Tab-separated table of C-alpha atoms in Angstrom:
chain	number	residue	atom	x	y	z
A	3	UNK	CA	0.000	0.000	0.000
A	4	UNK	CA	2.394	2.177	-1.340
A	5	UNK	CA	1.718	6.183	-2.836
A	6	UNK	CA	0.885	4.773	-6.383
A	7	UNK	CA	-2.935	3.250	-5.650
A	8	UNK	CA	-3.872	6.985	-5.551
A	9	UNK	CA	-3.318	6.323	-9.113
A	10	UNK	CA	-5.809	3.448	-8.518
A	11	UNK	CA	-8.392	5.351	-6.979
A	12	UNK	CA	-7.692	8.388	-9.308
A	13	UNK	CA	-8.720	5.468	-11.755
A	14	UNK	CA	-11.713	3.676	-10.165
A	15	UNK	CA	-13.322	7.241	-10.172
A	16	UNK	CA	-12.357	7.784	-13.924
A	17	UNK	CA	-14.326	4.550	-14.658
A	18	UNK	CA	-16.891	5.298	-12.180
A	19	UNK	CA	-17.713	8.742	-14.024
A	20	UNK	CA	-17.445	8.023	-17.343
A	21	UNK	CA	-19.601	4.890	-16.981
A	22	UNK	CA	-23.077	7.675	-16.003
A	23	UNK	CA	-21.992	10.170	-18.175
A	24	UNK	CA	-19.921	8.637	-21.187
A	25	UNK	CA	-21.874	5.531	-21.608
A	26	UNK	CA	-23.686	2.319	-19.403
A	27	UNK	CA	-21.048	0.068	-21.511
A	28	UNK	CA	-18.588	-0.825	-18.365
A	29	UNK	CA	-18.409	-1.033	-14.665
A	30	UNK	CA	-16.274	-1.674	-11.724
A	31	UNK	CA	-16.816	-3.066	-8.465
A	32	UNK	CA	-14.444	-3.252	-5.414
A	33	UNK	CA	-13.584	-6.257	-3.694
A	34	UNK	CA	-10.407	-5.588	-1.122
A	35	UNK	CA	-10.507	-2.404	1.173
A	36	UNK	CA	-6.728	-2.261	0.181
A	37	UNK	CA	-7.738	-1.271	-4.157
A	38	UNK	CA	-6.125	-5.078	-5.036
A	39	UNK	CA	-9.100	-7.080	-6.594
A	40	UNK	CA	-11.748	-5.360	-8.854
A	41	UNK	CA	-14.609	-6.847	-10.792
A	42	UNK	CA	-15.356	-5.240	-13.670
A	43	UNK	CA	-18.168	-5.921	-16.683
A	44	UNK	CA	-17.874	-5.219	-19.850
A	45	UNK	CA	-21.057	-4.703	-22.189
A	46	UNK	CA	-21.267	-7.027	-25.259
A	47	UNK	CA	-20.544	-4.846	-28.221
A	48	UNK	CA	-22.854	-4.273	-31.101
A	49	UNK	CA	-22.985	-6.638	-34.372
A	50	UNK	CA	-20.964	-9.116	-33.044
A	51	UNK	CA	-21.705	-12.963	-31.462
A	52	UNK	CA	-21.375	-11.490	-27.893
A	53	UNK	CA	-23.726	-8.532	-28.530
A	54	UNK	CA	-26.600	-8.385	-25.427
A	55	UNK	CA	-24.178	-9.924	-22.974
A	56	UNK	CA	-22.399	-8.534	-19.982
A	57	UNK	CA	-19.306	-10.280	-19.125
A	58	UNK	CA	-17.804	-10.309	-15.559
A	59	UNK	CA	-13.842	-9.605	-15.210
A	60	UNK	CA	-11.591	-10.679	-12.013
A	61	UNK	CA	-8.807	-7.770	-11.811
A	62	UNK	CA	-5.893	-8.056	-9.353
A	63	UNK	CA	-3.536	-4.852	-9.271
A	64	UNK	CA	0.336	-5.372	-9.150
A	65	UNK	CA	2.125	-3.717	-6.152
A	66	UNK	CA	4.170	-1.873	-8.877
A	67	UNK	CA	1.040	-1.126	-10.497
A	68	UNK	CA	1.379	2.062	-12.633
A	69	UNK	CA	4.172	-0.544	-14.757
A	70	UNK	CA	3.892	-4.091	-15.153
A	71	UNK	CA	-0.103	-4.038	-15.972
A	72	UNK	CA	-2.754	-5.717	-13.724
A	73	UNK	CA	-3.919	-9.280	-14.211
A	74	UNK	CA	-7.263	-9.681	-15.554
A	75	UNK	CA	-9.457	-12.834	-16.143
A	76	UNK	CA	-13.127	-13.510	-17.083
A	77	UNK	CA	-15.156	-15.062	-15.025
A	78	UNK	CA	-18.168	-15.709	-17.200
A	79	UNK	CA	-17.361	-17.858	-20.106
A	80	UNK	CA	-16.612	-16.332	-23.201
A	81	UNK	CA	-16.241	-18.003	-26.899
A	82	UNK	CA	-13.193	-16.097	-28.228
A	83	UNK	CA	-10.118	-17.227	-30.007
A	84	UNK	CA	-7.950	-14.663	-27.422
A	85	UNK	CA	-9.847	-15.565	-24.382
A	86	UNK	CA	-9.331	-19.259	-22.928
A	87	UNK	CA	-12.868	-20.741	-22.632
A	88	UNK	CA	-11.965	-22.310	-19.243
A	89	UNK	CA	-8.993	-20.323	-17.178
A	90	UNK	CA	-10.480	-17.010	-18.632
A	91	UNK	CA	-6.772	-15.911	-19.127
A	92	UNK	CA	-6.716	-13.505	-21.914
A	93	UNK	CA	-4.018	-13.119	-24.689
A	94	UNK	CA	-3.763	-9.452	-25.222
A	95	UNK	CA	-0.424	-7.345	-25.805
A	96	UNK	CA	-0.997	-4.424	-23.016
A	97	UNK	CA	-1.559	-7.375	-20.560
A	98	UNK	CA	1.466	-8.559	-20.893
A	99	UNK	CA	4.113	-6.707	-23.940
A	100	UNK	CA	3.256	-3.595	-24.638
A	101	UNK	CA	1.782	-2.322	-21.262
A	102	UNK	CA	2.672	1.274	-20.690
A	103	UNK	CA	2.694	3.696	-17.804
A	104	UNK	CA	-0.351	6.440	-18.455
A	105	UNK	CA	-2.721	3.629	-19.496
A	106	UNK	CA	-5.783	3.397	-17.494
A	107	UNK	CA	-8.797	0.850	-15.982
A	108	UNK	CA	-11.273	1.927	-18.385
A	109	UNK	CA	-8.235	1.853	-21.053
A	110	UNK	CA	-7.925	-1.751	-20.404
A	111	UNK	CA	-11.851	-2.380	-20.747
A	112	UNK	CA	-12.397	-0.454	-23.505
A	113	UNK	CA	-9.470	-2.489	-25.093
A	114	UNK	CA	-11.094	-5.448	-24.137
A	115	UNK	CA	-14.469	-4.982	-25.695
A	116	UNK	CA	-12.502	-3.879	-28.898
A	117	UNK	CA	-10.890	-6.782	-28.499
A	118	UNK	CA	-13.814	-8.767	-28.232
A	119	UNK	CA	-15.099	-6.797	-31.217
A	120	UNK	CA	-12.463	-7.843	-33.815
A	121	UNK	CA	-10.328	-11.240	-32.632
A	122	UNK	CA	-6.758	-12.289	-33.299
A	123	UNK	CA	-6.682	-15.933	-34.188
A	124	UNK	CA	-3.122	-15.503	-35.397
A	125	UNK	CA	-2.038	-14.600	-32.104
A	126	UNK	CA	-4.601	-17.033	-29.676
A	127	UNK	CA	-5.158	-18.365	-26.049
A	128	UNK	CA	-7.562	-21.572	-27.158
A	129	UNK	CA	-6.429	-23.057	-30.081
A	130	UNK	CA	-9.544	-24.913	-30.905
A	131	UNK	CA	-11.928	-21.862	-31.140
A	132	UNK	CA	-9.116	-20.178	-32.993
A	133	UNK	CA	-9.530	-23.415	-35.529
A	134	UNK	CA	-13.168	-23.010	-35.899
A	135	UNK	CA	-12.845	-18.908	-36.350
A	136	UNK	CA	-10.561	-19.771	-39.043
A	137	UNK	CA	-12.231	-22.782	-40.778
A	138	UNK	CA	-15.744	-22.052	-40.501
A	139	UNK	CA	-16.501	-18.679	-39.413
A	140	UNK	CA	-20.590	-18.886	-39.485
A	141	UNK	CA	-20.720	-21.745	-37.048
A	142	UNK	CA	-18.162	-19.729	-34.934
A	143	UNK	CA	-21.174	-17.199	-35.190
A	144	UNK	CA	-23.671	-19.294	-34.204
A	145	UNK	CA	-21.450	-21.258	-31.594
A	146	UNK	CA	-20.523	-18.015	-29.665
A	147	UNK	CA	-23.968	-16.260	-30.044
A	148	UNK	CA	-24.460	-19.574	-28.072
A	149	UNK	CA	-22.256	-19.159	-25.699
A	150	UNK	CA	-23.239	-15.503	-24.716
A	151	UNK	CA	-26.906	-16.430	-24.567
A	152	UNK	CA	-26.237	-19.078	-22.226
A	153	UNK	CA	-23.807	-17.284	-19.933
A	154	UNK	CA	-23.665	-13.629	-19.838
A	155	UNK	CA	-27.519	-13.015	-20.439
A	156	UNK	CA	-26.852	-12.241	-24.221
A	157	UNK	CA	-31.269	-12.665	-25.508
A	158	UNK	CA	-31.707	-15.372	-28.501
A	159	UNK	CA	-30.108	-18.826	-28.800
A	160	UNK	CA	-30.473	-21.089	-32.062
A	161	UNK	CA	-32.300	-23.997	-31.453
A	162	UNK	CA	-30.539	-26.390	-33.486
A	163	UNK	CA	-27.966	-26.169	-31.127
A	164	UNK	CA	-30.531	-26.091	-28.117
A	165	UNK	CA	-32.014	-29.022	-29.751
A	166	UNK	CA	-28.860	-30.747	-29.335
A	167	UNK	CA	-27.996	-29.923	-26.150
A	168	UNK	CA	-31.419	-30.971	-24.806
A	169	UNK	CA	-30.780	-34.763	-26.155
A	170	UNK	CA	-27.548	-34.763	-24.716
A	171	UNK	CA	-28.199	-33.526	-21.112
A	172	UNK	CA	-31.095	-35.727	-20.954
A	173	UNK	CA	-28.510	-38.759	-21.164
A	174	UNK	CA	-27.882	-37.361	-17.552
A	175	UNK	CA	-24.663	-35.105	-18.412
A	176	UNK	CA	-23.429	-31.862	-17.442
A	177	UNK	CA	-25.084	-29.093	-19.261
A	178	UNK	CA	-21.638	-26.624	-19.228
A	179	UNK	CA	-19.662	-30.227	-19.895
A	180	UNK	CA	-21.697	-31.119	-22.484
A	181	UNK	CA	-21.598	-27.153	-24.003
A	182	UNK	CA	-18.252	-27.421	-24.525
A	183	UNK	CA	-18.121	-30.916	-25.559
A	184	UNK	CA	-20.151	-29.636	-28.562
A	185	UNK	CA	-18.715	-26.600	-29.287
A	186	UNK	CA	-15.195	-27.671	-29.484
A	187	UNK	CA	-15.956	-31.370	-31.270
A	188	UNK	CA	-17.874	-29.310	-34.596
A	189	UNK	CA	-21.222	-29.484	-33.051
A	190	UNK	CA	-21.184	-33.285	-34.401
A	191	UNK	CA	-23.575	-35.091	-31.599
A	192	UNK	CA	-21.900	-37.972	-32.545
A	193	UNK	CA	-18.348	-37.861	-31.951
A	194	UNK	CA	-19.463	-35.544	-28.492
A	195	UNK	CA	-20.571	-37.848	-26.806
A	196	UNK	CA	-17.874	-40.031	-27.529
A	197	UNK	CA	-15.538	-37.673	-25.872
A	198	UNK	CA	-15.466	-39.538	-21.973
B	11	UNK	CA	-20.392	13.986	-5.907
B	12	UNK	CA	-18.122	11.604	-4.658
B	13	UNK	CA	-18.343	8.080	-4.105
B	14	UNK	CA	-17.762	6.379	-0.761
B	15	UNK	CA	-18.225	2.439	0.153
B	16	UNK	CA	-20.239	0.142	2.244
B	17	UNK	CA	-19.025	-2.875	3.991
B	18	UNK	CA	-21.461	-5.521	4.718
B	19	UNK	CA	-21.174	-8.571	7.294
B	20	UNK	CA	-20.485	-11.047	4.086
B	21	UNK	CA	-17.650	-8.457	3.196
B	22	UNK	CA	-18.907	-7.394	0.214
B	23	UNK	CA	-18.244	-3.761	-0.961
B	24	UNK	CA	-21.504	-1.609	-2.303
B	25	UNK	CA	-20.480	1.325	-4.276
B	26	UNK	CA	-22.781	4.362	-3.351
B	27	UNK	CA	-22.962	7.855	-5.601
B	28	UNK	CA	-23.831	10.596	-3.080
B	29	UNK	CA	-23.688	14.358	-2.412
B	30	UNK	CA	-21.966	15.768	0.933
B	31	UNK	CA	-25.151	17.524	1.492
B	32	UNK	CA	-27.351	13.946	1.003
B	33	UNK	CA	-28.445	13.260	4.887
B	34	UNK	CA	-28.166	9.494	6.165
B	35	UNK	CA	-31.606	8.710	5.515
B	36	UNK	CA	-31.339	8.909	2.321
B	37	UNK	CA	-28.295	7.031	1.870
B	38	UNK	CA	-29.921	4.064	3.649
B	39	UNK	CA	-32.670	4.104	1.126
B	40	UNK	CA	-30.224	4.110	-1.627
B	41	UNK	CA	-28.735	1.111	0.078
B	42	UNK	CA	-32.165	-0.153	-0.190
B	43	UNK	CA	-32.553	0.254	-3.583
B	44	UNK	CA	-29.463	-1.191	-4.278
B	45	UNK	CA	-29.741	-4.179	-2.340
B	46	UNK	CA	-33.318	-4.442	-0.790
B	47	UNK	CA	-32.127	-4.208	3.064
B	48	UNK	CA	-35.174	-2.095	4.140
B	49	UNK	CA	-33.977	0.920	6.412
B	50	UNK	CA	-35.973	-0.079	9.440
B	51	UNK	CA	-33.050	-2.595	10.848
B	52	UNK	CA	-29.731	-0.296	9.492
B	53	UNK	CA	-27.462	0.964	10.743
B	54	UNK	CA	-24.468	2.708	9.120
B	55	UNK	CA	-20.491	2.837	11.382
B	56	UNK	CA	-18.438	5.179	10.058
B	57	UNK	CA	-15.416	5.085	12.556
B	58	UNK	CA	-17.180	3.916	15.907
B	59	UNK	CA	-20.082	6.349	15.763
B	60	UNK	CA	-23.021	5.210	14.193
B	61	UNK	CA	-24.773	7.785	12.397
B	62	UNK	CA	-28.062	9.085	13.047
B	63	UNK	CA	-30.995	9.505	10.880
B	64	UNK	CA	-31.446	13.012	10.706
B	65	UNK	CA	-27.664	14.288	9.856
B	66	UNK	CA	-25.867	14.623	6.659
B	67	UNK	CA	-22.742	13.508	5.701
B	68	UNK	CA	-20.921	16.494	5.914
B	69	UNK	CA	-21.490	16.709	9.297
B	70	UNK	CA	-19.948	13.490	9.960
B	71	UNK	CA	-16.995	14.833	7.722
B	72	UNK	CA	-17.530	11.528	4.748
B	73	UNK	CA	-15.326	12.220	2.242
B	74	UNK	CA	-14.715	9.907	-1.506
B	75	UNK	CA	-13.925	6.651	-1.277
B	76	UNK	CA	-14.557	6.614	2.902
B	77	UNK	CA	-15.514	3.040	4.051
B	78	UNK	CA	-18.814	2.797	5.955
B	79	UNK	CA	-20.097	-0.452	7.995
B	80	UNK	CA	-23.596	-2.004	7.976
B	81	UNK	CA	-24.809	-3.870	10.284
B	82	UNK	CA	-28.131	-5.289	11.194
């Protein structure tokens, strides 16, 4: 608790106000007395697969923390070639290359949802998603539009998928276990259920 | 226009936006709306002196980011 979290306060305000003002798009939350863990949501942006969701960030602060940038991680499961679909670690170059010194909270955010508005699957966390982005981008679509309806509140779902999903579960399996027993075997019912 | 924080008995941290001249009444029913802890049975700690329904906060000398304590 050193005379550099005034920076971190200066910052939690920042968000704070420009979230009324500026926007409803993001949002922080404290956790520690000591300004160590945050959780943060991020809105899902427009015209993309995670559009109508809100997805929940972890965010511990470094004690160096105006260099070396914090450590973030989602905690509701995301469907993104940069974003692991189960740590929630996130492959992104200010979290861990090209952090600088004058970059703030809401930077980081906003970064994220632009981020989660136009993927990387050159440079990727989850290799498999990254695969499907790659291969076949409409069922990447579909399968993530999935994904955000069924975890951060995102409004429609497909029901071919649903459909799916149903059948399985009813052979008395885990719904989230059999979600991304789908997802990453190509949506075959098939060959998911082989994977025990 | 400053934000200060409440710290419940599960240690969870409620984020309130209030004005100096707001009164603690009001606050409480903000921490209602947030949550849905009704104000009859609330009380608010500051720093050992619990704070009484018909003061402000400047009175009490809150400040941002100032860490309250709710109890009951």
């Amino acid at each position: 608790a050193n005379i550099a979290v005034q920076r971190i306060k200066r910052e939690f305000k920042e968000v704070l106000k420009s979230e009324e003002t500026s926007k409803n798009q993001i949002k922080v939350d404290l956790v520690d007395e000591n300004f160590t863990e945050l959780r943060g949501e991020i809105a899902g942006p427009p015209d993309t697969p995670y559009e109508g969701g809100r997805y929940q960030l972890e965010i511990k602060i470094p004690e160096t923390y105006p260099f070396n940038p914090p450590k973030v991680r989602f905690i509701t499961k995301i469907w993104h070639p940069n974003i692991s679909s189960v740590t929630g670690a996130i492959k992104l170059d200010i979290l861990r290359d090209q952090w600088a010194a004058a970059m703030t909270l809401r930077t980081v955010l906003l970064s994220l949802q632009a981020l989660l508005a136009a993927a990387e699957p050159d440079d990727p966390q989850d290799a498999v998603v990254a695969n499907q982005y790659k291969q076949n981008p409409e069922m990447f679509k579909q399968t993530a539009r999935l994904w955000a309806h069924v975890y951060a509140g995102a409004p429609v779902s497909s029901p071919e998928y649903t459909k799916k999903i149903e059948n399985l579960c009813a052979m008395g399996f885990d719904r989230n276990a059999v979600i991304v027993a789908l997802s990453s075997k190509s949506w075959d019912v098939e060959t998911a259920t082989e994977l025990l | 226009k400053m934000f200060i924080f409440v710290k419940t008995l599960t240690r969870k941290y409620i984020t309130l936006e209030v004005e100096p001249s707001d009164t603690i009444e009001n606050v409480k029913a903000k921490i209602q709306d947030k949550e849905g802890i009704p104000p009859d049975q609330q009380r608010l700690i500051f720093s050992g002196q619990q704070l009484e329904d018909g003061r402000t906060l400047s009175d009490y000398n809150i400040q941002e980011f100032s860490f309250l304590h709710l109890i009951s």
